RNA sequence: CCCCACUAUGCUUAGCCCUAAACCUCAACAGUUAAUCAACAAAACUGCUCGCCAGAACACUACGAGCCACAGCUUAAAACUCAAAGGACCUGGCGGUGCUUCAUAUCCCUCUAGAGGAGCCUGUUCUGUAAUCGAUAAACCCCGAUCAACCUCACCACCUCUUGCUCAGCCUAUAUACCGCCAUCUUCAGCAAACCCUGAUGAAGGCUACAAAGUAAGCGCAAGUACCCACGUAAAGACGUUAGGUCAAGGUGUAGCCCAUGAGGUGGCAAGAAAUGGGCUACAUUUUCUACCCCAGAAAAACGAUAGCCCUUAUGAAACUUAAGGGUCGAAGGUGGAUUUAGCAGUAAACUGAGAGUAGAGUGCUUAGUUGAACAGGGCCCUGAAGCGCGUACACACCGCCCGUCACCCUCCUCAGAGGAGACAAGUCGUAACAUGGUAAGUGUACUGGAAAGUGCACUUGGACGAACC
């Protein structure tokens, strides 16, 4: 009830001041983020679900939205559509229909809110088909050359919706380079690509043809540079650890592509992304499950 | 309706015909 | 003697005909997708009344 | 699949990415603009923009693989190609200038043509009408045809008839036979076609 | 039942026969649509008349009677027996049930690798022993056990003790009394208290979005969370189903033992005629040995045991029997029948470690990691799933029900002894009926047959034909 919420608010203010005293911070400038940090320090809880940890927030955020009494002491409900049981939703529908009538007589940057968003706006429970009907009505409103007087309303239900180029450093001798990192399976690679070079590649201090004796891995190393047609132009130093030969080659490939992004043009960077050079392979070994031979292999069934 | 009564009558009649043929 | 060397035109016709059959299946499926569902919806909108209201 | 549905397979073609912007139709420009704002999978370790990349040979090596030994499978493939090329060069040099015009030495071309020859045009599929399945002749998709050609080639190589003969030599010899339209693989394809023709009477059992 | 041939017969004539689900199961005549009406069916009634009915079965029967009927038809009882029989519905299951749509390692084809063929490891069933117990279709079978030389141990033989380690004890029976922890569908998404309405206020049912009586708190899913993302894998997965597993984890009700079914000690079984399940090793040339961890050299009838025998070593008090190493031998086997397992991607497959538990002990189990695939497109016979329907004699719910023959004993009736009925009651041969009951069912009649019953002709729906066109 409202009196209970007011008492909770007063208790919250008293507690906020007490916590400011406890942390020695100024009560006046003592913010919600500071409250959160102080509570986290005072009551450290490692429960994974953040909602399970101690919270000292404002009553407005703590308690849900309680729909107000919709009829006075006289018994007469306030809203003319109260008896529909969905007065807010039907009022909204009625207003949208009126706007559509008015328009009919007179004449990637956003999205439609979700049903939960609409429900929270209306503090009412809706249905999938109710939401679909409302969205269809809104779509018709938009398409019907909705003017500013209509777009103002429409936007209330609208919700808004490239590789990061690394900086180029300069060595002690002044030659420019770019550094990047890349992980594949269990292999991690760090690559330094020089602006001007003869194509030499040194992996863990060993030349690439000696480190990766496999033509497949050398092809993987070639792929980044070959794509943007810069073979023989940049020298490379890679330090890679973990995983097998193929995983290490893939990690070096990713690191080299990310580093080379800085030295290629923006169109080249986008082309590499679309070619998949710049995306981290999320495929990693699946954990074995108890009671089955492998990650997916199950024990031979015995009928 | 099921035909249980008709089946009972049929069995009785078949048995009676067989008995008359036998004797 | 099944030597494809001396039956190239017939083999190519067979292959192209099979490809056209696949295309026909696909186009027919998409086009088929009045429908019984629509008809039932209309009948529901205007249902039979074998009784007294 | 660790990749969410949003992710799209990468396209690897330097020519496609270097195509002039003026040459692009409205739909092609739209496709490029859409991919500008799409998630793309990581480039698989099996393919690259290498001008020498051959998808057919890559797939053949994959089919020949045994237990994730990509290294051994690729080694066998390259040995087969080298053996084919060496045999062709020997024949070319030992042959007269007139027939040297026809003698072909490109191992990739020989491989492609041998597979295309081995591709079976019409297959036998079980079709069930009235509750009884019968091996009805049926047209095959190109994917199935290519796969059947490759599988027959590889199985013929793996057969135990050729004892103490290394896979490179076995496969090179069989590939040359197929290129010249001879050998057990072509025999098997003709046998499949003959069975289909014999069962031609059941074609109508198909419904699609 | 399906196919072929052929007869009586179906036809005409003259007589007989006089039966049908002869049913529109709805009598004739006259009348009404008003205050309805158990259910279903083909709405409810009024007046008048005739015929008929009075629990089921015995019984379209026996006797008597009549008849051109001679294995017949019409009329038609009684005795013994039972507490039901029956008609219509609702719910559930079931259907060799219909249509439509699906299964995403999934039911079939399709891809990969396997099992089913050899040896070995190991579990189980059987055989054996004086020598455990429990699981034992899916949902048991390297399962309780992340583990048996003694111990573990609950087993057998012998010996020993009796207020007993315990304010005793019992691995004694009961998982069909239970808690506890679980399998199972579940690779589901529904379960739902409290209300309201519909059915004449019956069991019951409650949907249509251009919406027509549903609202639902809560639980589950979902959401949230661990792992590396928001993906995926985990985890989670309600109500219930199989009286599903465990009285041997422990406790626990009931019952039972108390000079023993309790306790202790020594020794000992734990094997293979043989079948079968899972795994390991191989059958090699994409192989084997060596070096190296990927530019090599040799082998190649040899490949192939982790099997057997001998020796050593590790642990231990105890080692032929446990493990490791070495020597010795080089065995079966040459990619495997129908059938069958798993897998949708860092997955299958191959390879390499680590951990649990032990003093020691697994080819087992858990788990980290490396390399790393092919198909992913068609369908519905079978499996199944859903939706909408149909039938239903099943309700312990098709592993159901139930018919008839034959023999298994009593009551009654007819009878010169034998038949008939009923009851009791377990069998034998089939599966005739109930689902389209797997050939729809049945009436009359005729022939045939262990037996239900089959077939021929006509008749009935007390079956259906999926209900716009396709
Ligand atoms: K096998
Ligand atoms: Mg009888
Ligand atoms: Mg009639
Ligand atoms: Mg009669
Ligand atoms: Mg009589
Ligand atoms: Mg008489
Ligand atoms: Mg499967
Ligand atoms: Mg065997
Ligand atoms: Mg047992
Ligand atoms: Mg048992
Ligand atoms: Mg002992
Ligand atoms: Mg023992
Ligand atoms: Mg005891
Ligand atoms: Mg139980
Ligand atoms: Mg969840
Ligand atoms: Mg799970
Ligand atoms: Mg039980
Ligand atoms: Mg049991
Ligand atoms: Mg005892
Ligand atoms: Mg040995
Ligand atoms: Mg010793
Ligand atoms: Mg040897
Ligand atoms: Mg039947
Ligand atoms: Mg029948
Ligand atoms: Mg009949
Ligand atoms: Mg007959």
Curated annotation (Swiss-Prot), chain A:
The modification N6-acetyllysine is found at residue 195. It comes from the Eukaryota. It is found in: Mitochondrion. Residues 282-303 are annotated as: Disordered. One of its GO terms (molecular function) is structural constituent of ribosome. Its main location: mitochondrion. The keyword Membrane does not apply. GO terms for cellular component: mitochondrial inner membrane; mitochondrial small ribosomal subunit; mitochondrion; nucleolus. Keywords: Acetylation, Mitochondrion, Ribonucleoprotein, Ribosomal protein, Transit peptide. GO terms for biological process: mitochondrial translation. Component of the mitochondrial small ribosomal subunit (mt-SSU). Mature mammalian 55S mitochondrial ribosomes consist of a small (28S) and a large (39S) subunit. The 28S small subunit contains a 12S ribosomal RNA (12S mt-rRNA) and 30 different proteins. The 39S large subunit contains a 16S rRNA (16S mt-rRNA), a copy of mitochondrial valine transfer RNA (mt-tRNA(Val)), which plays an integral structural role, and 52 different proteins. Belongs to the universal ribosomal protein uS9 family. This is Small ribosomal subunit protein uS9m. It comes from Homo sapiens (Human). The lineage of its organism: Eukaryota, Metazoa, Chordata, Craniata, Vertebrata.
UniProtKB/Swiss-Prot annotation, chain B:
Component of the mitochondrial small ribosomal subunit (mt-SSU). Mature mammalian 55S mitochondrial ribosomes consist of a small (28S) and a large (39S) subunit. The 28S small subunit contains a 12S ribosomal RNA (12S mt-rRNA) and 30 different proteins. The 39S large subunit contains a 16S rRNA (16S mt-rRNA), a copy of mitochondrial valine transfer RNA (mt-tRNA(Val)), which plays an integral structural role, and 52 different proteins. Interacts with Aurora-A. It comes from the Eukaryota. It comes from Homo sapiens (Human). It is found in: Mitochondrion matrix; Nucleus. May act as a negative regulator of Aurora-A kinase, by down-regulation through proteasome-dependent degradation. This is Small ribosomal subunit protein mS38. Ubiquitously expressed and especially highly expressed in heart, skeletal muscle and testis. Belongs to the mitochondrion-specific ribosomal protein mS38 family.
From Swiss-Prot, chain C:
Transmembrane segments: none annotated. This is Small ribosomal subunit protein mS37. It is found in: Mitochondrion; Nucleus. Belongs to the mitochondrion-specific ribosomal protein mS37 family. Coiled coil: none annotated. It comes from Homo sapiens (Human). Component of the mitochondrial small ribosomal subunit (mt-SSU). Mature mammalian 55S mitochondrial ribosomes consist of a small (28S) and a large (39S) subunit. The 28S small subunit contains a 12S ribosomal RNA (12S mt-rRNA) and 30 different proteins. The 39S large subunit contains a 16S rRNA (16S mt-rRNA), a copy of mitochondrial valine transfer RNA (mt-tRNA(Val)), which plays an integral structural role, and 52 different proteins. A motif (Cx9C motif 2) lies at residues 7-17. It comes from the Eukaryota.
From Swiss-Prot, chain D:
The keyword Transit peptide applies. Belongs to the universal ribosomal protein uS7 family. One of its GO terms (cellular component) is ribosome. One of its GO terms (molecular function) is mRNA binding. Keywords: Acetylation, Disease variant, Mitochondrion, Primary mitochondrial disease, Ribonucleoprotein, Ribosomal protein, Transit peptide. The modification N6-acetyllysine is found at residues 174, 194. The keyword Secreted does not apply. The gene is MRPS7. It comes from the Eukaryota. It is linked to Combined oxidative phosphorylation deficiency 34: An autosomal recessive disorder caused by mitochondrial dysfunction and combined respiratory chain deficiencies of complexes I, III and IV. Clinical manifestations are variable and include congenital sensorineural deafness, lactic acidemia, and progressive hepatic and renal failure. It comes from Homo sapiens. One of its GO terms (biological process) is mitochondrial translation. This is Small ribosomal subunit protein uS7m. The lineage of its organism: Eukaryota, Metazoa, Chordata, Craniata, Vertebrata.
